[PDB]
Each structure stands twice: as structure tokens, then as C-alpha cells.
Amino acid sequence: IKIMKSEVLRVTHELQAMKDKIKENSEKIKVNKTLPYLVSNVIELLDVKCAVIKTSTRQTYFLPVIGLVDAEKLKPGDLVGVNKDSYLILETLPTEYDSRVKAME
Amino acid sequence: CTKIINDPKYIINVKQFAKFVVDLSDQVAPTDIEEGMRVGVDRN
Amino acid sequence: SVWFLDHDYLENMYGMFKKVNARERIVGWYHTGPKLHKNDIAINELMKRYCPNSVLVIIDVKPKDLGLPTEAYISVEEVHDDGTPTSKTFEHVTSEIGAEEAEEVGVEHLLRDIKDTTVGTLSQRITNQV
Amino acid sequence: VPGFLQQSQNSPGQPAVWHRLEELYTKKLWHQLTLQVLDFVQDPCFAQGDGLIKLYENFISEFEHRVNPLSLVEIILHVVRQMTDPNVALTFLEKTREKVKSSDEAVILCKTAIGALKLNIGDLQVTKETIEDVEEMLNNLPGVTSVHSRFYDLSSKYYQTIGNHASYYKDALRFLGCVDIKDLPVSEQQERAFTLGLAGLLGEGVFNFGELLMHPVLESLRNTDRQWLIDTLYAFNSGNVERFQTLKTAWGQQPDLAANEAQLLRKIQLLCLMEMTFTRPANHRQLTFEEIAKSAKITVNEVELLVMKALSVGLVKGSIDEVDKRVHMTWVQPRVLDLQQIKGMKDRLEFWCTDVKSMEMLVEHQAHDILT
Amino acid sequence: KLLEHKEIDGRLKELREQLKELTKQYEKSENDLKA
Amino acid sequence: VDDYTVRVIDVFAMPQSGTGVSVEAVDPVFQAKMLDMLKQTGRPEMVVGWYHSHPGFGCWL
Amino acid sequence: MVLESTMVCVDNSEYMRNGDFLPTRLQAQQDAVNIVCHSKTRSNPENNVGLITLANDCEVLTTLTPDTGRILSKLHTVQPKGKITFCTGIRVAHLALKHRQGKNHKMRIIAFVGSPVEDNEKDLVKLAKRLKKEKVNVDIINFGEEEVNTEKLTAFVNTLNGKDGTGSHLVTVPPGPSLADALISSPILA
């Protein structure tokens, strides 16, 4: 009986507070994810969780942390959109085919 | 624009500079830009 | 034994600083009081509530020409071995003042008018020995 | 059931205490009733058979908060000591442990109680397992509390039964520090002081002996009744001969001392070397072989081996010369001090600081122009 | 009445597991912000 | 303090945002709460200006 | 509608754990704090309420907040494993009130005295005198087992208001129905 009211109140308040704060975190990440998304490739992945990125600018950068994506769902050669200057991976990009590649079909 | 992503996102090859994932400005409509079309982009 | 320290204020400030720079986690507390205080242990426990390894750095704001201005203290609970009553106390940890590139540049600019020349000029060597 | 204590109230304790306990139960004032029960179990009337308690304490066992589960285990340990059956004491302790998983402090006391009660039967590696488990659990506790006293009591009792002396001396010192000092029987204080002195004297790796002078346990007790323990401890600490006191004690305390007389004499010689290093003016640190032979009552050729052992164990960091029969002394092992020793050190440091001040003044005055 | 109380435990226990998952999800959100 | 002097005592960083150094980098909630909480400590100062880092290039606007 | 900041002093002493009340002393005080916080917040939507544990030396679990959620969440895990120190608790609560976000809020302290106050009468009278001029109203709720209408607490409340009294009350609840309902009568209404 006591558990019903006590846990309902406490857990409901915790859920609401964490919902608001998760919404704030998601808004912060969404706003910080600047759209330019300099495209890059992950030449190699090494365990400290860290990635080696070769930007489309023809430069390779070591990343102290992968970024906003999961290391497990990544492998060499994947198209990852890193930031213009920070060079941190912001989002995985779907397999892209150059116009010439499509034309060859 | 090598590819169109689906707010839609566009992968644009700036000749030799680098590859960018940019979105259209309010001036242009999404239907105007098609995959493989060469389009202008601001330098910033 | 009466002392009020904001919990919500501390947490909100830490959240703000984490937003500004998340590499900094709470590591302890400082009080400018030249000597320790009888209620410092309770404050240290409250700080431990936010960081298990809390260091109290007593940053004296009185310029003393002999010694560093910091004294890092930690809380130690032991059995004392030598058959003596045990208490919270405050174990001491060596303290030293370092700097990073930006802080070093700021310090050098600030003290460019009262800074002794770098290099072992005999005058400065004899003065240091004294 | 509630009137069962009333029936027990009629004719094992006082009617007033029984009535107060019954009223506390009825009022539901469980904590005050728990303090009353703890005081009751303190009554000497519990000497032969209990039966009724813990059956009345079923309420404590079932209740989620029998006041402090530490208090519940305090009551349970007294009950177990009352029932004094090794076969069933362990199972009762297991049930108590199960009932008090909530408070990690309570589990420590339960484990210590089971180890102590089990120490009399099968005091083998199984007991050491309990000691290690309590060590692991106790090292996690936020700070020193009531369980540490029981832990160290069990450790001291165990090591005394294993033969290991130095560890027992260390653990007895720890326990004495972790207890109130006073609030002890006085007879228990004397017994603990005697065991600590014997452990220190026989300790294979203990020569500090600095807590004999300062620890109140050795002072309050053993002052008049069989002072020879304090006398021999002071002799060891000073490192002098005091062989007549050793013979006096050999007359008594025959077990654990007559057998290890040889080790005791070796330790006293090694500490005599330390005292010779101490009393030296700190400048004439070279010790003549004749002086060491006379101080330690060791033959001319025995001093070489004695000094070598002193260096080996880690008590002196000097060097030994045979041609001149002088032993170089560079002593790193510290020693406990006395108020007179502290006064001497204080005046010597006063001389040192006056010298430093004089040199600083000379340098400052001679280099005023260059100082800047 | 025992069944009803046990039924409440089901709803209460579901929330406890959910909040634990939400905390695990959020703790990831903090981690990516630091990175 | 007066017409010929602008005194800055404290500077508090605003969180990095995808916008950059622009009017939208001044998170109103963050600024309001920061000022409110600094007032309690004893710093009831006004906002006298803003600062931004120009990596590489010199001090210009 | 009066704008006041309440800093409830919930006791977590060892005596707070002999359940003379129905579920347990701790649960009774939890219900009491819940009712008091809800009443204070509903009376005015901009008022504040915080809680300080009175065991060991003191604790400030929830500094003044406008939402009762933090207070209720911190109320769980009260863990009654100490002893009470009333004068120190009242002093700490007064300091917390002094650190009020809005100075306009009227002073008000609710103390859940559930264990005997091992404090001298002179200390209590001096604290009451200091609180009087400072302008802080303390509402003492004598709880469960004690000297019925404890003399020290009654004298404290009496000196807190002399020759005229409002917002300063002492409530003594003999064992019986959950104290949460009792508090709704004397303190909350007036």
C-alpha cells in the first residue's frame, strides 16, 4: 500500500524531471550539430573508441572520441560527416555513389 | 549535388575543396534542386 | 556547528560549467580562511557527496613571502594502529601552482613590470640564497 | 504471547524492569524498548539458560527496524553466548545474518561473532577465511565504528592461538585504539596489557615498543600487580642490560618466555646497539668494538654478527670496519621520545636556528650592495 | 486485496525498470556532449 | 563607471553552440540564470560587453 | 496567499523509528511533510519550502525550492540513524531562510520534534529571543513519545510570541491516528 503512493509519486517526478532534462540535452545537441557536415572517411578504428578520419579535404585527423555516433556501428571506409573545424564525427552518412558511378550502370 | 538526403539534406562536391552536407537556403525551393545538378553555395 | 552551503546552487553552477567545459569535474573545495576550522569536516563530507576524492585547498589571501599560498587537505579515516582514538582529521597532500599556456601568457603579461629577469644573474642568485 | 513476558515477569529479573519492557512493547515504543532490552541482557541474571528471549525477540527479528540491526546483533551475540551450543550457535548466527542483510555494518558483527564462537572449534584456515572476508567488508565501511572493535578482538584472539606474535601485538594495539579505553573491566585491561607486552617482547618483527610508555592500557593496569612486564618493556626500549629482571620474569610467566629466552636476548642485544647509537653525541658516531661488547654482553667476535644482523633486518644503515674494530653508524630507524629527550632536541634545534640566523645576517650585511 | 496490491507492484516495477533505462539513455546523452 | 572608462571585473563564458559567435550564441536562459546565481555570491555587475576568440586571425570584427 | 518560505525540519533520529504511529514514525512524518508542503504550495503558487534533517549535526537536503517534488524525493532515504540537535537545526534553518531567493517571503519554520530535546532551557529561550527580533516564525510539532507538551518546547514557543501570537504555534499529538491528518488542523489552517 505504501509502495503504491510513495513509488508512484517519486518515480513520476523523476521521470518528468529526466524527461525535461533529456529534452534540453537533445535540443542542445541538435542546435550544436551545425549542418555543413564536412564529409569524411574512417580509415581505421582503434581501441582507446577512437577513430582516424581522412577528410574530403585530403587530411587525416585522429579523434580522441568518435562523437555523436556509436563505435560499434562503424568500420573502415564508412562515410561519416565530421564538423568543418572540430573534425568530430556528427552523423553517419548513407552509402553515396558519385554521379559517374550511377551513370556507369 | 552528388546525392539528396531524406528536412532534406544535400551532399555537395565543391569541385576539389571538399565534400559537404548542406541544406538549401529559403530562397530556393526543394523541388528546384535535383541530384547531379551543379548549384552555387555560400563561402561561409 | 551552524553552517549553510547551497546544494542546489552548487549543482546549478556545476551544470553551467559542464555546459561551458565538461572536462572539469568537481574535485574539492577551498576556503580562504588562513587556518582550518572545526566545521571544515562537515563541509568536506558535503563535498564528498559530489566527489569521493575531495581536496581542501586553503588559498590564503594574505601575501606571505615565505611559502606557497595553497595547502591541499584530504579526509582520512583510519584506526591509527598505535592504539589511539581515531577521528576524521585532515591528511595533507603536497600542493604546487602550475599553469597552462593561456594562463601562463596572461600571467606573463600581468607581471611584466614587477618580474625579475629570467637567468641566473649574480644579484638574483645571492638574493635567492639569502 | 505479549503476556508471556508477564509470566516471565512473575518471579529471571526485576518486576519493575519486566513491567517497563512490557509497557514499551505495548506502547510500540520499539527503540526505547530496544535500549531496555539491551540493558536487561546486561543484567548478571543471564547465567544459566534463557529459553524465553529471542522467542520474545521474534518481534525484533521480524520487524524491519528492530532499532539498529547493529543493536539486534548486539542482543543476538549475548543470546548466543548464553545458549553456548557450538552446533546450533552457528546456525543461529546464519539466521541472524540473513535477517540483517540490510545494514552492512550488522553483517560485520555477525561474521565476527560466528568467527569468535567458531574459533574454539576448528580454528583452521576456515576461520582465516572469515577474517579476510571481514577485512574486505570492513575496508569498505565509511569510517571506524563498533564493528571494528569486534573485528580486531577476533583477530587478536586468532593470532594468539596461531602463535604469530608480532601480528597479534599490532592487532591488539589497533583494538585498544579502537575501543573506549575505560568502560573496560580493569581486569580485562590488565589481561590485555599483559598479552600485549608478551607479544611485543616475543614479536619476531616488533621492536618499536613506543606504545608501552604512552598507551594508557599499560599505565593504568600492571602498575602494581606484577610490574615486571612494564619493567622488562622499559628495559627493552632503553636497551640496557636489565638481565636480573629477565631472570625474575623467567621465574614466572614460564610459558612463552622460557622457551623464547634466546630470541628475547637477541632482541635486547639488537636494541642495545640502537641505544648505543642513540646516546652517541651524533658526531662520534663510530662505536668501538669493546664498547658494544660490554654494553650487550657479547663476546669480542659476536659483535660482528650482531651488527650484521642489525643492518640486515633493516634497523641500521651504517657500515662495519674490522681493522680498527670500530663500527660506522648511520641510523635510519626512528625511535620514540621522552619529554626530556624532546627538551634536548628543542634546545639543540634552538642552537641550530641561532646559527642559521647568524649566517643569514652575515650574508645579508656583507652583500647589501649586491642584494637588491 | 492481495492481488490488487501485487498488481500495483507490476505497474510500479515497470516504471522502475523504465527509469533505470532512461537514466542509462541519458547517461549516454551526457557522454556524447562531453565528447 | 563614467563616460571615459568601461571597467570589466568578471567574464563568464557562454556555452559553445552551432550558431557560433552570433546574437543566438547568447542563450537567454543560460545568461539569466548565470547572472541571477552570480548576484547571490556578491557580483551584482551589469553586462558591459561581449568577447569572442578569433583563432589565427587578429583582433578585428 | 501570504508569501512565506517554509523550511521543514524533518527528524531522522533513531527515536523516529519506534512506530507508535500506524505504519511507522518515519512514514507518519513523511505523510506530514507531504501534506504540509502541498498546503504551503497550494496556498500560494510562488512560495518555497525546504527540509533539513535534525539528526547527527544537521543536513540541508533540499534548499529552498518552489516545487515540492525535490522535497518529497529527498524525504525518502531519510534513514533514521542518528540523534537530534534542535538548537543547531533551528539555527541552520534560519541561515537557509536568510539565504532566501526572494526577501519578501515571510519567515516560517516547521520542526518535527520526534525525539527528546537534550538541550538546556536557557539555550532554547535565547534562540527564541534571537528568532523573535530576526522575525522568524517556528511551528513546533511535538511527535509521538515525549514529555506530554514538552516544557522546553512550550516555553520556546511561548517566548517566540509574547502578549501577542500569530504564525507561531506548538502542536502536541498523542499517539493514535496518523499525524498527517492532525497537522492539517492546527498549523496548516492557521
Swiss-Prot record, chain A:
Keyword Transferase appears in the UniProt entry: no
Q: How is it modified after translation?
A: Sumoylated by UBE2I in response to MEKK1-mediated stimuli.
What is one Gene Ontology biological process annotated in the Swiss-Prot or TrEMBL record? Answer: modulation by host of viral transcription
The lineage's top-level taxon is: Eukaryota
Similarity section: Belongs to the AAA ATPase family.
**Illness association:** Deafness, cataract, impaired intellectual development, and polyneuropathy: An autosomal recessive disease characterized by early onset of deafness, cataract, severe developmental delay, and severely impaired intellectual development. Patients later develop polyneuropathy of the lower extremities, associated with depigmentation of the hair in that area.
- What does the annotation say about its assembly with partners? Component of the 19S proteasome regulatory particle complex. The 26S proteasome consists of a 20S core particle (CP) and two 19S regulatory subunits (RP). The regulatory particle is made of a lid composed of 9 subunits, a base containing 6 ATPases including PSMC3 and few additional components. Interacts with PAAF1.
Give the protein's recorded name. Answer: 26S proteasome regulatory subunit 6A
**Naturally occurring in which organism (per UniProt):** Homo sapiens (Human)
For this protein's source organism, the top of the classification is:
Eukaryota, Metazoa, Chordata, Craniata, Vertebrata
Part of the intact protein present: 52 to 176 of 439
Curated annotation (Swiss-Prot), chain B:
Annotated coiled-coil segments of the chain: none
- Entry PTM: Monoubiquitinated by RNF181. Phosphorylated. Dephosphorylated by UBLCP1 which impairs PSMC2 ATPase activity and disrupts 26S proteasome assembly.
Q: What induces it?
A: Expression is not cell cycle-dependent and occurs throughout the cell cycle.
**Location in or out of the cell:** Cytoplasm
Locate the N6-acetyllysine modifications and list their residues: 15
**How does this protein assemble?**
Component of the 19S proteasome regulatory particle complex. The 26S proteasome consists of a 20S core particle (CP) and two 19S regulatory subunits (RP). The regulatory particle is made of a lid composed of 9 subunits, a base containing 6 ATPases including PSMC2 and few additional components. Interacts with NDC80/HEC; this interaction is detected only during M phase. Interacts and SQSTM1. Interacts with PAAF1. Directly interacts with TRIM5.
Entry similarity comment: Belongs to the AAA ATPase family.
- Outline what the protein does: Component of the 26S proteasome, a multiprotein complex involved in the ATP-dependent degradation of ubiquitinated proteins. This complex plays a key role in the maintenance of protein homeostasis by removing misfolded or damaged proteins, which could impair cellular functions, and by removing proteins whose functions are no longer required. Therefore, the proteasome participates in numerous cellular processes, including cell cycle progression, apoptosis, or DNA damage repair.
Q: What is this protein called?
A: 26S proteasome regulatory subunit 7
Curated annotation (Swiss-Prot), chain E:
Compartments (UniProt record) = Cytoplasm; Nucleus
Q: Which residues form a coiled coil?
A: none
Q: Which residues cross the membrane?
A: none
Could you describe the subunit structure of this protein? Component of the 19S proteasome regulatory particle complex. The 26S proteasome consists of a 20S core particle (CP) and two 19S regulatory subunits (RP). The regulatory particle is made of a lid composed of 9 subunits, a base containing 6 ATPases including PSMC6 and few additional components. Interacts with PAAF1.
Q: Which family does it belong to?
A: Belongs to the AAA ATPase family.
Instruction: Describe the task this protein carries out.
Output: Component of the 26S proteasome, a multiprotein complex involved in the ATP-dependent degradation of ubiquitinated proteins. This complex plays a key role in the maintenance of protein homeostasis by removing misfolded or damaged proteins, which could impair cellular functions, and by removing proteins whose functions are no longer required. Therefore, the proteasome participates in numerous cellular processes, including cell cycle progression, apoptosis, or DNA damage repair.
| Entry protein name | 26S proteasome regulatory subunit 10B
**From which organism does this entry originate?**
Homo sapiens
Full-sequence portion shown in this chain: 15 to 49 of 389
From Swiss-Prot, chain G:
Q: Where is the VWFA domain?
A: 5-188
- Looking at the keywords, is Repeat present? yes
Cysteines paired by S-S bonds: none
| GO MF term list | identical protein binding; molecular adaptor activity; polyubiquitin modification-dependent protein binding; RNA binding
* Any one GO cellular component localisation term in the record: nucleus
Q: Does the keyword Phosphoprotein apply?
A: yes
Indicate the family of this protein: Belongs to the proteasome subunit S5A family.
Protein name according to UniProt: 26S proteasome non-ATPase regulatory subunit 4
What is the organism lineage in this UniProt record?
Eukaryota, Metazoa, Chordata, Craniata, Vertebrata
